[PDB]
Design a protein around this ligand. Structure first.
Ligand code: MG
Ligand code: MG
Ligand code: MG
Ligand code: MG
Ligand code: MG
Ligand code: MG
Ligand code: MG
Ligand code: MG
Ligand code: MG
Ligand code: MG
Ligand code: MG
Ligand code: MG
Ligand code: MG
Ligand code: MG
Ligand code: MG
Ligand code: MG
Ligand code: MG
Ligand code: MG
Ligand code: MG
Ligand code: MG
Ligand code: MG
Ligand code: MG
Ligand code: MG
Ligand code: MG
Ligand code: MG
Ligand code: MG
Ligand code: MG
Ligand code: MG
Ligand code: MG
Ligand code: MG
Ligand code: MG
Ligand code: MG
Ligand code: MG
Ligand code: MG
Ligand code: MG
Ligand code: MG
Ligand code: MG
Ligand code: MG
Ligand code: MG
Ligand code: MG
Ligand code: MG
Ligand code: MG
Ligand code: MG
Ligand code: MG
Ligand code: MG
Ligand code: MG
Ligand code: MG
Ligand code: MG
Ligand code: MG
Ligand code: MG
Ligand code: MG
Ligand code: MG
Ligand code: MG
Ligand code: MG
Ligand code: MG
Ligand code: MG
Ligand code: MG
Ligand code: MG
Ligand code: MG
Ligand code: MG
Ligand code: MG
Ligand code: MG
Ligand code: MG
Ligand code: MG
Ligand code: MG
Ligand code: MG
Ligand code: MG
Ligand code: MG
Ligand code: MG
Ligand code: MG
Ligand code: MG
Ligand code: MG
Ligand code: MG
Ligand code: MG
Ligand code: MG
Ligand code: MG
Ligand code: MG
Ligand code: MG
Ligand code: MG
Ligand code: MG
Ligand code: MG
Ligand code: MG
Ligand code: MG
Ligand code: MG
Ligand code: MG
Ligand code: MG
Ligand code: MG
Ligand code: MG
Ligand code: MG
Ligand code: MG
Ligand code: MG
Ligand code: MG
Ligand code: MG
Ligand code: MG
Ligand code: MG
Ligand code: MG
Ligand code: MG
Ligand code: MG
Ligand code: MG
Ligand code: MG
Ligand code: MG
Ligand code: MG
Ligand code: MG
Ligand code: MG
Ligand code: MG
Ligand code: MG
Ligand code: MG
Ligand code: MG
Ligand code: MG
Ligand code: MG
Ligand code: MG
Ligand code: MG
Ligand code: MG
Ligand code: MG
Ligand code: MG
Ligand code: MG
Ligand code: MG
Ligand code: MG
Ligand code: MG
Ligand code: MG
Ligand code: MG
Ligand code: MG
Ligand code: MG
Ligand code: MG
Ligand code: MG
Ligand code: MG
Ligand code: MG
Ligand code: MG
Ligand code: MG
Ligand code: MG
Ligand code: MG
Ligand code: MG
Ligand code: MG
Ligand code: MG
Ligand code: MG
Ligand code: MG
Ligand code: MG
Ligand code: MG
Ligand code: MG
Ligand code: MG
Ligand code: MG
Ligand code: MG
Ligand code: MG
Ligand code: MG
Ligand code: MG
Ligand code: MG
Ligand code: MG
Ligand code: MG
Ligand code: MG
Ligand code: MG
Ligand code: MG
Ligand code: MG
Ligand code: MG
Ligand code: MG
Ligand code: MG
Ligand code: MG
Ligand code: MG
Ligand code: MG
Ligand code: MG
Ligand code: MG
Ligand code: MG
Ligand code: MG
Ligand code: MG
Ligand code: MG
Ligand code: MG
Ligand code: MG
Ligand code: MG
Ligand code: MG
Ligand code: MG
Ligand code: MG
Ligand code: MG
Ligand code: MG
Ligand code: MG
Ligand code: MG
Ligand code: MG
Ligand code: MG
Ligand code: MG
Ligand code: MG
Ligand code: MG
Ligand code: MG
Ligand code: MG
Ligand code: MG
Ligand code: MG
Ligand code: MG
Ligand code: MG
Ligand code: MG
Ligand code: MG
Ligand code: MG
Ligand code: MG
Ligand code: MG
Ligand code: MG
Ligand code: MG
Ligand code: MG
Ligand code: MG
Ligand code: MG
Ligand code: MG
Ligand code: MG
Ligand code: MG
Ligand code: MG
Ligand code: MG
Ligand code: MG
Ligand code: MG
Ligand code: MG
Ligand code: MG
Ligand code: MG
Ligand code: MG
Ligand code: MG
Ligand code: MG
Ligand code: MG
Ligand code: MG
Ligand code: MG
Ligand code: MG
Ligand code: MG
Ligand code: MG
Ligand code: MG
Ligand code: MG
Ligand code: MG
Ligand code: MG
Ligand code: MG
Ligand code: MG
Ligand code: MG
Ligand code: MG
Ligand code: MG
Ligand code: MG
Ligand code: MG
Ligand code: MG
Ligand code: MG
Ligand code: MG
Ligand code: MG
Ligand code: MG
Ligand code: MG
Ligand code: MG
Ligand code: MG
Ligand code: MG
Ligand code: MG
Ligand code: MG
Ligand code: MG
Ligand code: MG
Ligand code: MG
Ligand code: MG
Ligand code: MG
Ligand code: MG
Ligand code: MG
Ligand code: MG
Ligand code: MG
Ligand code: MG
Ligand code: MG
Ligand code: MG
Ligand code: MG
Ligand code: MG
Ligand code: MG
Ligand code: MG
Ligand code: MG
Ligand code: MG
Ligand code: MG
Ligand code: MG
Ligand code: MG
Ligand code: MG
Ligand code: MG
Ligand code: MG
Ligand code: MG
Ligand code: MG
Ligand code: MG
Ligand code: MG
Ligand code: MG
Ligand code: MG
Ligand code: MG
Ligand code: MG
Ligand code: MG
Ligand code: MG
Ligand code: MG
Lengths: 49, 272
RNA sequence: CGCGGGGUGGAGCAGCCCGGUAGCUCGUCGGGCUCAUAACCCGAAGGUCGUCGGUUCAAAUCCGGCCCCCGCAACCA
RNA sequence: GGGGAACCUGGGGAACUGAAACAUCUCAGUACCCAGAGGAGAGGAAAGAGAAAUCGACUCCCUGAGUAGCGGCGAGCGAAA
RNA sequence: GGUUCGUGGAGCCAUGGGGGAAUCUGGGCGGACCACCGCCUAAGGCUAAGUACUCCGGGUGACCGAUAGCGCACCAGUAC
RNA sequence: CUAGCCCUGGCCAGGGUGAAGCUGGGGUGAGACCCAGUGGAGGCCCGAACCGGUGGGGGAUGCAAACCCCUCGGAUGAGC
RNA sequence: CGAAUGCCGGCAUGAGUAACGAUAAAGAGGGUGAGAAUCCCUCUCGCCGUAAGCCCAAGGGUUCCUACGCAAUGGUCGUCAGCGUAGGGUUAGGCGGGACCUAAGGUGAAGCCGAAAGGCGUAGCCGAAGGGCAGCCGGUUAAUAUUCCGGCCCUUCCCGCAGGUGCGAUGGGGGGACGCUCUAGGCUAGGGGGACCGGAGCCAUGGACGAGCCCGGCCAGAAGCGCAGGGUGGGAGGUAGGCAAAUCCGCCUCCCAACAAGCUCUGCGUGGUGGGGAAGCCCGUACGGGUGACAACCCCCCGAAGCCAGGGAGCCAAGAAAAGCCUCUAAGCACAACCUGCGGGAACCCGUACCGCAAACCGACACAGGUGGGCGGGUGCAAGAGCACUCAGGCGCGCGGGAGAACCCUCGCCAAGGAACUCUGCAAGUUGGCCCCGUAACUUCGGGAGAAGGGGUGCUCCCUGGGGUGAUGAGCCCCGGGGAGCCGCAGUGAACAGGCUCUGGCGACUGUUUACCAAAAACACAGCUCUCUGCGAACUCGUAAGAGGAGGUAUAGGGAGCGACGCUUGCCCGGUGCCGGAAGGUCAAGGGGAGGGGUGCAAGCCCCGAACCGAAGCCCCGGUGAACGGCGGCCGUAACUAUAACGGUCCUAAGGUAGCGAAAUUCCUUGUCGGGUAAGUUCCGACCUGCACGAAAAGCGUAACGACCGGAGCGCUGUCUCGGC
RNA sequence: UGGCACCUCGAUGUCGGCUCGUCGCAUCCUGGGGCUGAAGAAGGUCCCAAGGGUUGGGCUGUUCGCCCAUUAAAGCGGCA
């Protein structure tokens, strides 16, 4: 029953990435409230090598 | 001609493929004068704009010569005839003395080893390219420029052929494959002859499959969709149009002329 | 049994909406033409305008009931 | 060059609702988007107001006034001296 | 488009398009318009103060008192 | 996730039928054509993986927010 | 505050009830321990084996190993653990990425466009399981190893010495470079054998010390050699092309060479040399360690879908780029510089534990689901990755114990009958592999065909014909034919393996579909017609720029409808649509001002406003039906009745032709006749008063296909009589 | 078959079949019995009386119904 969540590092760092948010003017605003709100994680955690 | 197949399978009972007799000796293309990575993909930046396009065999573009006036005088021996998968018509690979090789959308009657050339000088004969106005009024030609030095454009679709009717001051009258009569500038080069493989029009795809090979995706009829999707759709149990036949977008499809009126192009044309 | 149209000499239609007279084609009847019939020519006759009541000075024609004929409707159940 | 809770100017700019239906009208130049400004910003020394031959840059508060007016003259909106 | 002004007798201040002056006996305004009579000088620019806000610091409360009070008095914008 | 398309890779046991072409023979003025043999075609056939999901039964606070079992469809293609 | 299926919290009821997550299965003796069916050990037993076993990628992130433990988590127990605490553990120039390349796509100097945010976009840059690039076999740890160590073998950089040479670019050229299907010639992994070689041992219960039983008979390896095969003509003249230049490529001409030889480059053997190396027996918690050995390490046969590989043949749908790498010359420099030897140095960053078809990934769970790549042994069954059993290896699924009721599930069998069951033979049966007979209508000649329906199939001895490896013989494998004979109820002896005919409707056909109630007669489809489009095409996305169309150009693009194929596709443009009409009527801003008005003492300043000139559209004239659409009513007549070819009359734009027809269309209607059945509202054939068929929303047919829907029959059956065990 | 709409629209699942029945009598059969246009045998009709029986098939989703073959008979109706 193949589900909705199929993990993929690149796909995730490239989609909701920090540099991604910066690229777009809407991305910026996200962070902006994420900061204002006082979140410990602005972007999702996902690493590599 | 065209080969037919014994019906040892349905979808074969009617299939026919163009024979490749004059396909000279080839198969592989000249890797200099072409090919070029051909950017395949059925739409513009983003959305799709030409429905039912997609998939279907890989393809390498053949950068063919469309302005022979480049090398006036310099002649060429017709090296061979190749299959180009980007155009109904066949093509000719020629060797100029100059040492430069080019491909020329090949005309009917064209023979390997035979010779040809371009320029005012040139003799009126299959393959030679001349400024329209230096052509014998009434001699059919193919590959024709529209406005001088702006490349070839009319007639280049297999069996296609334009014909001189007469000339006026600068222009010469031409009857394009559309029966339409038009005037073109004398300076526009045209290469005498008449394209070839005039049979293409007689191939029978045979099976839904082959239409995908070419790269043509299944085409949904309007009367199948739903109102939201198309002007022809709903109530079902089949149904007549119920309004003048329309396009997905709304314009009448049978009749309604679309050539814009106030065009500059007119004043140079006289009916289709 | 809802809604709409209609029923005029032997046949098929018009007249009615804007009430006072009922017209047309065919057929029917007499005369002619032809050896004779048909065709054709001349002339003629022929109708409670479904039916019962009502409106008016007067009704096919305007109003109402009854009857018959045709068209559409009879759905969510 | 980017940031800053609100406040500020400008460039854009809705709809639900109200009208006991809805279409002009209202909700509103409101929400939200964008750019810029700074501890403020805006405005500011008259081609002004208005009837007094009068006042005298701008800004902000109270009155004037829910007046004058505006308005499917409906719902409602609403100054300045 | 703005003004109370939704074409209305619609002026005034802005303009997108078109036409297109003048230099002070020149030129705008006083709610169509004209004549009187007044008012003011447009098409460059700057300017404190009084005003608004409160992330931050402090003071008070006929304010709350751990289901209340900020979502968090507790390592919460966390765990999840 | 799901739909489509673009770039680059991968996958499809084993069987079966046997097209065109060739070669020889036959035939004819020359042919078409007729035989064998070779040959290997095809949204061709039987059938695993693989992709499906036809009928029936179970499951129905499940093993499971779509599953299990038997049984079927396609399987070099508009294939996965 | 009692109520808002109110909000938060707590605790009840059902209930000691249903459950405890695949019916692959367990049993005993020792151990340990406060306490064990549940943990360690050993012996039996069962299950997986194209796996339920190995290796890799993603994802997960310490779950790896070890020492202590058991409150909680493990659907029971727990002395165990993937759980708690603590400590170890993941070692490279050559493996994978980065210091190399380019794909789609991103981004993007120029430059374009946008009210702002921002949208495009040339070169370049980023971008990979694609390209390019230097390593194998062993030993070692509790836990890492193509990294540590051993043996053998390579790769670039910098410097140095010796020797060649016009050396040299981000530029020119070559190459890299490429499809699908079918294939050859050799090899290899891998496997089967052996009368031969090496081995601890065993003769058990009647028999055998036998060319017996049983275990094992290899792996890596530079140079040079061989044995396969891939690559590539050498010269000389010219030269106007490869956007500078070339001695290079590309062209012409002439010499030699020519299904080769030569030079090259792989693979495969062999190779100096190095390493491994059962069974069984002995210790032994664990699960390793000796011994076997100075182990032997040889011969045949089968053999890849893997290698040689850019090999070959055939076909059309005609099959990436860039760098490395060669070569050619530019500025330069020619004491440089490259090229070749040989020495000596230099050689970074990140990953490397462990699970990995799963109790460690995606499914809230130790969830009977889902997850890409490679290896995946042996025997048999015609083949195979199938089926049955079994190696290596790994498991008995984290609740058990007894009983032996109903009832449910899954399964087996059955008297006689056989579909009488039922909406329907739904379900279940029947049939099923292979070899050989033998097969009808109809047909688009292919098909229908595995049509149907038959027989054979085991084992023993004899005779004999062909293949491949040796060599033309031996053995070893692989294809046959004939002749006798044995035994069972039965010989594809178990497991995998069509039930079959006849005749209708729909769709031609293989395909698609409502992920999670519909797979269909619906969609698609080749094909046919219509209509737009002459190229800065038409159409589509976009405010624009730009882009798709297309690096296409009417044998092509877009839009629509029908929908293989055959035979056909009637009549009507009155209304609507679309096409054509340089005339008319109407027609808005605008032009034009007849003439009127408000003001001033006036010059003037301001307003109106009729002619008449003024588009497209509309009206008006024509066309057009595989454009939207439409395609009559009433009376009357013939040698008996009946009907009605014929007629009369209204009405129209015209008044349904062919062909079909109680139909996927028929209301009345189980229409009326025939056919099938003992009996037939359905079914097949007819007839036509077609409520309300009918010609590309096609008409009527049609071979072949349909997990489509309907009606017969044969076979066989627990579907049923009617249940039973 | 309807009319009314009274409880139920925070839900009272509708035809038919199968299974399991049970009740009524306005008795289909078998028991009594009066009449009779009752010789007999058969019937007709009406009165008592359900105690117990009340078949199997073909066509239809059918209930009903039409048939085939029998029978002592092949009852009708209530129980959402
Ligand atoms: Mg989820
Ligand atoms: Mg992805
Ligand atoms: Mg090629
Ligand atoms: Mg290239
Ligand atoms: Mg984009
Ligand atoms: Mg493909
Ligand atoms: Mg098409
Ligand atoms: Mg279609
Ligand atoms: Mg539809
Ligand atoms: Mg849409
Ligand atoms: Mg629409
Ligand atoms: Mg429609
Ligand atoms: Mg319909
Ligand atoms: Mg024409
Ligand atoms: Mg009524
Ligand atoms: Mg009458
Ligand atoms: Mg007479
Ligand atoms: Mg007469
Ligand atoms: Mg009268
Ligand atoms: Mg009267
Ligand atoms: Mg309705
Ligand atoms: Mg209904
Ligand atoms: Mg800022
Ligand atoms: Mg604003
Ligand atoms: Mg609204
Ligand atoms: Mg309202
Ligand atoms: Mg409303
Ligand atoms: Mg307002
Ligand atoms: Mg200020
Ligand atoms: Mg002031
Ligand atoms: Mg208010
Ligand atoms: Mg108004
Ligand atoms: Mg306004
Ligand atoms: Mg004024
Ligand atoms: Mg202006
Ligand atoms: Mg003045
Ligand atoms: Mg002004
Ligand atoms: Mg003014
Ligand atoms: Mg005034
Ligand atoms: Mg003033
Ligand atoms: Mg100034
Ligand atoms: Mg200031
Ligand atoms: Mg404070
Ligand atoms: Mg304090
Ligand atoms: Mg208190
Ligand atoms: Mg709180
Ligand atoms: Mg706080
Ligand atoms: Mg605190
Ligand atoms: Mg998927
Ligand atoms: Mg799809
Ligand atoms: Mg792919
Ligand atoms: Mg064959
Ligand atoms: Mg010959
Ligand atoms: Mg043959
Ligand atoms: Mg042949
Ligand atoms: Mg062969
Ligand atoms: Mg197939
Ligand atoms: Mg098939
Ligand atoms: Mg299958
Ligand atoms: Mg595989
Ligand atoms: Mg299923
Ligand atoms: Mg079920
Ligand atoms: Mg159930
Ligand atoms: Mg099948
Ligand atoms: Mg198959
Ligand atoms: Mg209360
Ligand atoms: Mg209970
Ligand atoms: Mg119980
Ligand atoms: Mg459960
Ligand atoms: Mg229980
Ligand atoms: Mg369990
Ligand atoms: Mg035990
Ligand atoms: Mg024990
Ligand atoms: Mg156990
Ligand atoms: Mg054990
Ligand atoms: Mg032992
Ligand atoms: Mg096996
Ligand atoms: Mg597999
Ligand atoms: Mg398991
Ligand atoms: Mg990982
Ligand atoms: Mg996890
Ligand atoms: Mg941990
Ligand atoms: Mg240990
Ligand atoms: Mg322990
Ligand atoms: Mg515990
Ligand atoms: Mg547990
Ligand atoms: Mg559990
Ligand atoms: Mg426990
Ligand atoms: Mg475990
Ligand atoms: Mg632990
Ligand atoms: Mg090393
Ligand atoms: Mg690795
Ligand atoms: Mg470096
Ligand atoms: Mg570095
Ligand atoms: Mg580079
Ligand atoms: Mg890089
Ligand atoms: Mg690119
Ligand atoms: Mg930029
Ligand atoms: Mg961009
Ligand atoms: Mg790059
Ligand atoms: Mg490659
Ligand atoms: Mg690579
Ligand atoms: Mg490389
Ligand atoms: Mg490497
Ligand atoms: Mg080697
Ligand atoms: Mg390990
Ligand atoms: Mg190792
Ligand atoms: Mg080493
Ligand atoms: Mg080397
Ligand atoms: Mg030197
Ligand atoms: Mg030298
Ligand atoms: Mg050189
Ligand atoms: Mg030089
Ligand atoms: Mg260079
Ligand atoms: Mg170089
Ligand atoms: Mg190059
Ligand atoms: Mg090729
Ligand atoms: Mg081979
Ligand atoms: Mg070997
Ligand atoms: Mg071997
Ligand atoms: Mg073998
Ligand atoms: Mg063996
Ligand atoms: Mg052996
Ligand atoms: Mg061996
Ligand atoms: Mg032996
Ligand atoms: Mg031997
Ligand atoms: Mg021995
Ligand atoms: Mg020995
Ligand atoms: Mg021995
Ligand atoms: Mg010994
Ligand atoms: Mg011994
Ligand atoms: Mg011995
Ligand atoms: Mg013995
Ligand atoms: Mg042995
Ligand atoms: Mg042996
Ligand atoms: Mg080996
Ligand atoms: Mg070796
Ligand atoms: Mg040469
Ligand atoms: Mg030369
Ligand atoms: Mg040159
Ligand atoms: Mg040059
Ligand atoms: Mg060679
Ligand atoms: Mg070699
Ligand atoms: Mg080697
Ligand atoms: Mg060697
Ligand atoms: Mg050794
Ligand atoms: Mg050993
Ligand atoms: Mg050893
Ligand atoms: Mg011990
Ligand atoms: Mg032991
Ligand atoms: Mg030893
Ligand atoms: Mg020893
Ligand atoms: Mg071989
Ligand atoms: Mg292979
Ligand atoms: Mg091969
Ligand atoms: Mg290869
Ligand atoms: Mg090849
Ligand atoms: Mg070769
Ligand atoms: Mg120089
Ligand atoms: Mg040097
Ligand atoms: Mg060197
Ligand atoms: Mg060295
Ligand atoms: Mg090193
Ligand atoms: Mg490791
Ligand atoms: Mg590892
Ligand atoms: Mg595990
Ligand atoms: Mg593993
Ligand atoms: Mg799996
Ligand atoms: Mg796997
Ligand atoms: Mg595993
Ligand atoms: Mg476990
Ligand atoms: Mg977990
Ligand atoms: Mg478990
Ligand atoms: Mg699982
Ligand atoms: Mg899990
Ligand atoms: Mg899948
Ligand atoms: Mg899978
Ligand atoms: Mg194998
Ligand atoms: Mg064996
Ligand atoms: Mg096997
Ligand atoms: Mg056997
Ligand atoms: Mg087999
Ligand atoms: Mg298996
Ligand atoms: Mg098995
Ligand atoms: Mg064995
Ligand atoms: Mg084992
Ligand atoms: Mg495992
Ligand atoms: Mg065990
Ligand atoms: Mg269990
Ligand atoms: Mg386990
Ligand atoms: Mg038995
Ligand atoms: Mg049996
Ligand atoms: Mg029986
Ligand atoms: Mg029997
Ligand atoms: Mg039977
Ligand atoms: Mg029978
Ligand atoms: Mg039956
Ligand atoms: Mg029956
Ligand atoms: Mg029955
Ligand atoms: Mg049936
Ligand atoms: Mg069945
Ligand atoms: Mg059988
Ligand atoms: Mg059988
Ligand atoms: Mg035949
Ligand atoms: Mg048979
Ligand atoms: Mg048989
Ligand atoms: Mg035997
Ligand atoms: Mg003999
Ligand atoms: Mg023999
Ligand atoms: Mg032999
Ligand atoms: Mg061999
Ligand atoms: Mg034999
Ligand atoms: Mg005997
Ligand atoms: Mg026998
Ligand atoms: Mg026998
Ligand atoms: Mg068998
Ligand atoms: Mg058999
Ligand atoms: Mg069997
Ligand atoms: Mg079987
Ligand atoms: Mg079968
Ligand atoms: Mg059929
Ligand atoms: Mg039918
Ligand atoms: Mg179909
Ligand atoms: Mg058809
Ligand atoms: Mg569909
Ligand atoms: Mg599907
Ligand atoms: Mg569905
Ligand atoms: Mg389904
Ligand atoms: Mg299907
Ligand atoms: Mg057609
Ligand atoms: Mg547009
Ligand atoms: Mg088209
Ligand atoms: Mg077209
Ligand atoms: Mg259709
Ligand atoms: Mg059709
Ligand atoms: Mg018409
Ligand atoms: Mg018309
Ligand atoms: Mg007309
Ligand atoms: Mg027109
Ligand atoms: Mg005017
Ligand atoms: Mg005017
Ligand atoms: Mg005046
Ligand atoms: Mg006056
Ligand atoms: Mg004035
Ligand atoms: Mg006009
Ligand atoms: Mg009009
Ligand atoms: Mg009709
Ligand atoms: Mg009929
Ligand atoms: Mg019938
Ligand atoms: Mg019929
Ligand atoms: Mg029918
Ligand atoms: Mg009958
Ligand atoms: Mg029957
Ligand atoms: Mg009948
Ligand atoms: Mg029809
Ligand atoms: Mg019709
Ligand atoms: Mg027609
Ligand atoms: Mg039609
Ligand atoms: Mg038909
Ligand atoms: Mg048919
Ligand atoms: Mg199909
Ligand atoms: Mg009632
Ligand atoms: Mg209700
Ligand atoms: Mg309730
Ligand atoms: Mg309820
Ligand atoms: Mg029922
Ligand atoms: Mg009684
Ligand atoms: Mg009696
Ligand atoms: Mg009966
Ligand atoms: Mg039936
Ligand atoms: Mg009853």
């Amino acid at each position: 029953m193949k589900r909705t969540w199929q993990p993929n590092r690149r796909k995730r760092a490239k989609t909701h990435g920090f540099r991604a948010r910066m690229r777009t003017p809407g991305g910026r605003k996200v962070l902006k409230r994420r900061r204002q709100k006082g979140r410990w994680r602005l972007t999702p955690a996902v690493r590599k090598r | 001609a065209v080969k037919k197949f014994k019906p040892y399978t349905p979808s074969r009972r009617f299939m026919t493929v163009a024979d490749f007799s004059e396909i000279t000796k080839t198969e592989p293309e000249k890797s200099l004068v072409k090919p070029l990575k051909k950017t395949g993909g059925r739409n513009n930046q983003g959305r799709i704009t030409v429905r039912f396009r997609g998939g279907g065999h890989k393809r390498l573009y053949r950068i063919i010569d469309f302005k022979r006036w480049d090398k006036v005088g310099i002649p060429a021996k017709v090296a061979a005839i190749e299959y180009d998968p980007n155009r109904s018509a066949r093509i000719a690979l020629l060797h100029y003395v100059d040492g430069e090789k080019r491909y020329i959308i090949a005309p009917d009657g064209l023979q390997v080893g035979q010779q040809v050339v371009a320029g005012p000088d040139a003799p009126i004969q299959v393959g030679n390219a001349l400024p329209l106005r230096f052509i014998p009024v009434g001699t059919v030609v193919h590959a024709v420029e529209l406005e001088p030095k702006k490349g070839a454009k009319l007639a280049r679709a297999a069996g296609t052929s334009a014909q001189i009717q007469g000339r006026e001051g600068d222009y010469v009258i031409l009857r394009l494959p559309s029966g339409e009569l038009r005037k073109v500038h004398g300076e526009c080069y045209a290469t005498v002859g008449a394209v070839g493989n005039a049979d293409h029009k007689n191939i029978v795809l045979g099976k839904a499959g082959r239409s995908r090979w070419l790269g043509r995706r299944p085409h949904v009829r309007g009367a199948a969709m739903n109102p939201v999707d198309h002007p022809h759709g709903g109530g079902e149990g089949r149904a007549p149009r119920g309004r003048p036949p329309a396009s997905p977008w709304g314009w009448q499809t049978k009749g309604l002329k679309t050539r814009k009126r106030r065009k500059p192009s007119s004043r140079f044309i006289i009916a289709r």
